[PDB]
Symmetry: T
Subunit: 134 residues, 12 copies
């Protein structure tokens, strides 16, 4: 089945050392090393993430979500994310607890299945093979 | 490469209580899943639990001297121990903090960790599968 | 006369989610309700929904320049957009903030709203009805 | 059938100057007017006012036995009474919190309320009519 | 040999509402229970409930002046009333704060008390038996 | 020319206890002291006392009507009662808050008051003379 | 039927200090005192003291399995130990927190406990006798 | 009997800026007024004003050495200066803190003083007569 | 060199609204003014405005790519957006944060900025001229 | 047309180290830089520095008497001195608070100013040129 | 005669990693420094380290019962232990609390201590010599 | 080597004031004890005292241009003065904060210091012997 990998603001600026296009490629290759198909999408717009997230709620598909800094400010994002009936994994490339004190709070974490933080790009792959239990 | 998995207070219990939250797999079963699964990655995994803060510091020092990676679920001490943060700050190999359960979905005092700011990173919410994934990460630093 | 009923993010999507919190009626059903009711009262409701702050602001700006009353349920944005608040502060005719659910009976953070300080009034927890009680008011003033 | 409208401290003083923020309507006019509209909706209003906490509680307890609805403007006690909060908690018919001024547009302390969380909804800053709209809510259920 | 058992606002409704937090047995039977038990220990119990803060302060003053010990469940007034604390602050005989429910296992606000700092002791969450245990302490003092 | 002198909860008990913290002069002695002073200043002083919040409010309402100055010691309601503050916000004539002890040298919670922001002035720590000095102030306007 | 009395750090030197804040009663005198009164009520007290969190933790584990009750005085860990809180969360029999002193009359840091929200109830500031009253609650259930 | 009237920073500009706020009376006019009150009261008052913190401490020292009461309006330093507070704590004779305007009807930072806690009492918001009333209080001690 | 002037939400409504808070100059005038100054110093000024967080982000990215300096006014996103902050973080050229009004004179919530920490400098409350002074700096480096 | 530039504590040490946060030019060189720069604008600048708060206040007073503008760099006093604030709150001509370094990128206590709400505007983080641009703002409106 | 010198969690790793921040002296070497310094002054120091809070508490009761001075560096526990503060409150002989690093130059949570308020005095940031100056303090008083 | 011993406000009154807290040695004696002790250690120690912040800033600048160690007790300035902090940040030789009394056992606001973060070290509450121990440490370098 399908896994939605949604990246938030500033994530298209990637390049860790890997770029975003390279990240789409490693996520997909792996997904396929499992019975999984991955759809990686990226936008700097709250309304666009909102859209993708609704689309995943109607589909009832897992979502992986690294929301950038909206992790820390968006409730809109949280509320439309609660409805998700499949797992939600929150991913942060860098360790947000080792930075400014405001990064140590997330409107998403409470409603996520789980959260992976600070393990780099591999945060994405790790999450995929949590999901591969359905 | 050796890997240290260290489990703090109350992890000896498990999954003898609170299946809804903490799972249902025994601590023994867990030693066995971690070990077999690490062998399968080409690592050797030493796993221990202890309810004793002093003992966890000892093992963490040992890791520091031997320069080995650490997978640490400090349990309750996660939210209270500065002593434990300090011993871990010494580690030069990766330290991953693990939570079986999703702390951000419980009492607010659990949303705070003295260790996170000093780990390489954190897994929370993913159940037992959370170790193992930490293994995979370490498997290629 | 003319009244702009603005609904923010995750609205739309009404009736397709926790019926325990938001009722079971659609966004298309609510609008029918709103604009039938507005006639009963000799006004013309204009009802819209966007998940885009930028969009919601455009609408506010428009109601400011035509000096039309606004009934606004800003959804999530309510607890976060100083921007959204800055737009409504310019309104020269009444502004009524409306929440479907009772925000005072949920997570503590839904209890502060950037918009209320600068609204004429606020209706919370009266369900979908809240919009129609907002209409009237209005009708009077 | 019966709907209990109840006002707290200083509301006897309505109309009679203080009207930059509370209006020119006296309390007996408001009584007349809530009953005028209540009748015109099929309901029978019982409007009462007291400066006494113990009297307010006593009225609330009686509604909780009669299983009648309560529209409550507790004035200043909104912001401080847990006693008033608790008495309202047992109400099985709707409770509607109502304020004449926009509490969010004044002193910071006025922005908290012990009542909201355990009420069905709140109406704030609509003036008098705040009351009439709560009656409208009730009539529709 | 004389002991005052003073019950604050809402306690009169004990019964009667939410059997799962406050208990099944009503206020009259609480009186009756307490008086039999105070007699057993060779004490005369004067149990009294009011919804009126001024009434409570008065009872308290009488107790100060007669140097009688006092057992107190202030109700909502525990978290809010400095007057009450000031009345209490002058008892020469012991003063025991009692609450049927575990306040700490509830809303944040219930967890602060004006009374505890100037009380001899505090008994909480032990149900209606808390009053009886309070009588034991006094019998032996 | 009438000055209202108004003492809230526990001032009934002045002199009866706490010799160092409040002094040995009783409420009656105070009432007399205050009347003498008034009629040496061209004034008429009515001194009342109540442990009831409702009564205090009533008296405030009556001063607001007659446009008369108030010297007010609210005791424990100073720190807690928003109802009081609002009643007081309506007086056309000067309001002077008075405290016998130095509230600033005691528990934290006593250092804040709801009254002073809306009072002409506050005299604190000056013991019984507070009232007589406040009288003098009013004699001068 | 068996009751677990568990005392934490510092409690091993009762009476060896401060007749003022705690009793003039030693630990063994208290153990004798507890065992005896326990027998009177038809129970089996097992009183046990440790300065060690790890050892406290394991006594709690045993009691959770044995499905026995627990009277817990954790000492300073009361205010510091999430691990202690978490071990107790699992007890099926009642948990009752006991404190010789009235903690609420001391440093503000002593006025918060991690234990209380998960306990059947709490007894504070009633000296050595707080344990004997705890036994009475359990004899009763 | 010598009283010391000390005025801190900005006070030399009275009358020349504001009010009211600070009244129309100038510092020179206040000097004459305190000289006439001092005569009427049968004592002495030495008024001095300085924008300098160290000047103020020196004067305060001399008063602590000469056992003289102090009346102090310390201007901005009231809110910020621990130096002045320590200096004041030493006074054996009474210390009355005076503020011309009502500090409680302004910015929240004005509502905290470092002086009130170690002062005999505080007069606030009676304008310039504040100084006069405090001189009268000292004419008892 | 080329300077980017970016202006976020509501800045297209330069009065239009609130003359005494933001000034009488419109956005179109500001552009022309900015361009005279640019030209008068030999720079190119690109001025652009949007009510969209995504847009501003995107303009920021292409300034980061072009290594061009940015004179930014996020107008409200300033207080709320950490995303916006993350984008400016990559600016290698200098970043000037500009506010037309003095935010320190306004509600407290305007007094924190997520941007200031990473800005080169900040100019606040000099009205439209803030932008001009910010070019003048970029001219001199 | 005089403009007063006022520098507070430690600004006499400009360029005597550190590199780094404040720049290489010393206070004597800046004094002259500014005077030259005011003359090219037709202003006449008086630059003064002092480490004495009284001095500063005396200086602000003369500007208040002369209706003259003021560029103030209070240094450390900015975060601490309510006395400076009130001084300044009386200037009828523009007040520009200037800081050489970017206070928002240093310790959190440096992000708050008592001056800012009463200045006309604030320039932060543009180094020595801060002063130069404040003159430029002043050569207008 | 006797001074109890007690070190808490983590002090066993002094100078054995990392810093800089805490000097480059081993705990063993510190034990020696303090003991020779204590002899020069005509005192006998007992120097103990433990990562175990029960062990720290235990040494403290003993110091309380013997009425001997404690010079204490509780390391991690300083910021978190109420258990430790209560045991220490019993000391009627002088209690001087020591820190090798400057706690006020570091993370906020390190700037509060449950121990300072019941200590005679505190030395912070004077490195290893913190300990010696406390010994000198004890020895300039003495009757 | 020359060591600068700087004492702030109120420390000239040392020894003639609550010896309970500051002990009974005067300030002149203190000068001698320090001078003497410094000689046997082989250092020249200049000791200075002022109540004036400017005077303290100046002494520190001199020490900073000299590159000489400072032993500093700012008294009350420690908790308030940022100006003082910044003057000390500039010192290249070690700086020792010294407090005669144990600040951690007095009022809470004394438990913070603007100086400790930037000082080599602090000695607190070991009385006057603290200044000597600061010399002893400086001789070691
Ligand atoms: O994945 C994160 O660790 C993360 C955490 C955040 O608080 C924000 C965030 O978005 C970005 C914030 C800055 C930069 C980049 N980037 O792609 O170079 C992404 C990413
Ligand atoms: O792994 C966690 O998510 C976790 C988080 C905590 O805040 C504490 C914690 O330790 C336990 C706390 C209680 C029980 C069990 N258990 O083994 O059923 C473990 C574990
Ligand atoms: O109208 C509300 O009660 C409300 C309150 C909020 O704090 C957020 C909010 O946005 C929504 C959040 C989730 C769902 C829906 N919906 O109507 O399907 C709306 C709506
Ligand atoms: O209904 C209110 O808006 C309201 C809110 C309060 O916080 C207090 C309150 O009581 C009053 C407070 C002041 C005046 C009047 N009055 O009827 O002129 C009423 C009324
Ligand atoms: O006894 C208590 O547990 C208690 C705790 C409180 O915070 C308030 C209190 O007063 C009441 C508050 C609500 C209800 C009832 N009641 O007797 O049904 C009593 C009672
Ligand atoms: O809340 C106060 O700080 C306060 C201040 C007062 O001057 C009076 C007051 O009411 C009383 C509070 C306690 C005692 C008495 N009394 O006259 O025995 C009165 C309370
Ligand atoms: O039992 C208590 O009231 C208590 C409360 C505390 O905050 C701490 C505590 O641990 C102790 C702390 C100091 C002494 C003793 N003791 O039994 O001599 C016990 C005990
Ligand atoms: O006496 C006061 O009300 C007062 C309170 C303060 O917080 C500061 C204060 O200092 C002054 C602050 C500004 C002006 C004047 N003045 O007399 O022209 C005095 C005066
Ligand atoms: O939130 C602010 O502090 C803020 C400060 C500004 O200088 C601008 C700003 O954005 C605006 C918010 C509201 C209106 C207008 N406007 O251009 O009339 C701008 C917001
Ligand atoms: O001008 C500033 O940016 C500034 C900000 C402060 O928080 C304090 C301040 O005073 C000084 C603080 C340290 C040094 C110097 N100096 O002249 O080298 C000045 C200056
Ligand atoms: O002595 C200190 O400055 C100190 C301060 C602390 O906040 C903790 C502390 O214990 C240690 C904390 C970490 C390391 C080491 N060590 O001996 O390398 C000791 C020691
Ligand atoms: O030396 C101290 O511990 C100290 C701490 C302070 O917070 C202030 C302080 O200044 C003094 C404050 C009051 C008196 C005296 N004195 O020398 O009698 C000094 C001194």
């Amino acid at each position: 089945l399908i896994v939605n990998v949604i990246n938030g603001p500033n994530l298209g600026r990637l390049g860790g050392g890997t770029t975003h296009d390279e990240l789409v490629a490693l996520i997909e290759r792996e997904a396929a090393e499992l019975g999984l198909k991955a759809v990686v999408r990226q936008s700097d717009s709250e309304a666009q993430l909102l859209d993708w997230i609704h689309q995943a709620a109607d589909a009832a598909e897992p979502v992986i979500l690294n929301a950038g800094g909206l992790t820390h400010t968006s409730v809109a994002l949280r509320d439309a994310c609660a409805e998700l009936s499949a797992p939600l994994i929150e991913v942060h490339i860098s360790n947000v607890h080792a930075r400014e004190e405001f990064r140590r709070h997330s409107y998403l974490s409470p409603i996520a299945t789980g959260v992976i933080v600070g393990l780099g790009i591999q945060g994405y792959l790790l999450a995929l093979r949590y999901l591969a239990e359905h």
